[PDB]
């Protein structure tokens with residue numbers, strides 16, 4: 087790989103030297119640089135394939151170099167921003183590969199006048215939120231809950247958060263972007279064209295190029311927002327409460343109200359026994375009095391009271407939504423490292439019809455017998471129902487009541503232990519089949535699941551890619567494929583779930 091390392095130095099601009107950005111295993115730095123952006127401990131095992139090199143891009147020129155050199159030397163590049171990829175596809179590969187690490191490109195330039203912000207893809211959601219909140223307590227951006235998530239993957243993959251019912255996705259709130267293409271041209275919306283600007287807003291940036299920055303459209307948040315978390319076990323009538331949630335959370339609750347439902351298995355009231363806990367976690371873009379009127383009318387079964395409501399800034403709602411204390415200092419959002427790392431599996435599903443009470447009691451018995459899997463239900467409807475399926479590569483719009491995330495975490499290392507938790511996760515997904523979308527079984531790209539299929543990027547690539555691509559992108563998969571064939575016909579930008587060429 088020394089002709090590649092030489093091509094990189096060969097392409098170095100003298101204003102921004104590439105050498106301090108190149109790490110090979112002979113640098114004693116290498117291990118911690120690889121490890122710094124790892125967010126799934128499954129992909130930090132000794133047996134996990136390591137890149138032979140990491141470029142920690144310090145300038146647009148380092149990206150241009152890495153693309154041009156990797157391309158003429160036929161090398162697999164993995165782009166990494168926040169490293170949250172649930173499958174580690176940003177830092178893991180079964181062919182020899184290097185990682186282009188974007189974390190040093192984390193500029194956030196907030197313009198409250200135009201309600202916009204130029205955000206480098208190496209920035210985290212927490213840095214973006216922190217930087218908005220420093221200029222204005224009445225602006226925000228409808229992205230994800232996890233402060234350490236990277237902008238690159240989050241927006242690339244169609245990121246959502248607790249204001250999607252009001253403002254839609256992250257990708258519904260982009261005015262411009264900067265991207266380096268297969269040719270090493272630095273492009274913006276204008277030079278990139280509407281096809282590529284569409285593709286990188288939910289179609290997985292890493293199939294099309296290195297996104298350097300999104301220009302994001304900020305949104306108005308109220309001077310006061312309301313949050314709550316209310317927990318109900320099966321013994322507190324959780325079945326009736328969940329059942330009612332299903333009928334209102336996407337369909338009836340005003341667009342200002344997001345009520346997430348987290349389902350997990352906890353110790354019951356009788357010793358040794360387990361029960362299902364239904365946690366209702368909410369952001370209301372408004373005050374407790376309007377919320378309490380909504381909930382008394384549309385969802386009284388939750389028993390939401392004034393004592394459940396916390397009123398705070400939009401920025402402190404973010405803290406609350408990531409289990410940080412509501413009085414924590416805001417700069418905790420600048421920590422790029424989560425307080426806990428675990429072994430984890432994620433899958434997703436979409437629900438299009440409410441689960442009958444019989445079906446919920448079914449799920450409670452299955453969840454109690456598998457103990458560890460949890461499910462998170464994220465209501466869609468409001469703006470998510472108003473945007474056409476074609477507006478972004480992300481297709482899941484009207485007709486979807488909610489998105490399920492299957493959440494299985496564990497601490498025990500080793501494949502044997504992994505296989506057990508993966509198996510539990512696959513079983514709950516299996517049980518959920520009749521309740522969730524079918525023909526095809528919809529999936530959310532950002533909840534990446536290699537169980538949906540692996541693109542080996544040879545002869546079979548288009549065939550293999552259909553297996554996850556139709557699930558992620560439904561009928562938009564064909565447009566992604568057309569655009570991929572035009573912007574990257576040689577499939578330089580590839581990964582285990584990349585958009586294939588025709």
Ligand SMILES: *c1c(C)c(C)cc2c1nc1c(=O)[nH]c(=O)nc-1n2C[C@H](O)[C@H](O)[C@H](O)COP(=O)(O)OP(=O)(O)OC[C@H]1O[C@@H](n2cnc3c(N)ncnc32)[C@H](O)[C@@H]1O
Pocket residue numbers: 125164165166167168169170171172174175176177188207208229230231232234235236237238239240241242243244245246247290291292293295296297298532533581
């Ligand atoms: C909470 C937590 C704790 C995690 C780890 C993930 C979360 C999350 N909460 C989320 C939420 O509330 N809403 C969401 O929509 N998603 C949430 N996620 C998932 C998260 O959005 C995805 O995992 C996302 O992909 C993370 O992005 P990242 O941190 O940038 O992750 P990677 O560096 O692993 O990259 C992911 C993926 O995108 C490609 N990529 C990264 N950077 C790129 C640039 N600059 N250009 C092009 N492509 C880029 C990577 O190659 C990889 O394929």
Ligand SMILES: CC(=O)N[C@@H]1[C@@H](O)[C@H](O)[C@@H](CO)O[C@H]1O
Pocket residue numbers: 121124127130131427
């Ligand atoms: C983030 C993390 O847990 N990384 C571990 C590191 O702590 C451990 O010491 C190292 C062996 O030296 O192996 C890594 O996977």
Ligand SMILES: [Cl-]
Pocket residue numbers: none
């Ligand atoms: Cl997560």
Ligand code: NA
Pocket residue numbers: 116117120136
């Ligand atoms: Na290593």
Ligand code: NA
Pocket residue numbers: 338339340380383384
């Ligand atoms: Na109402």
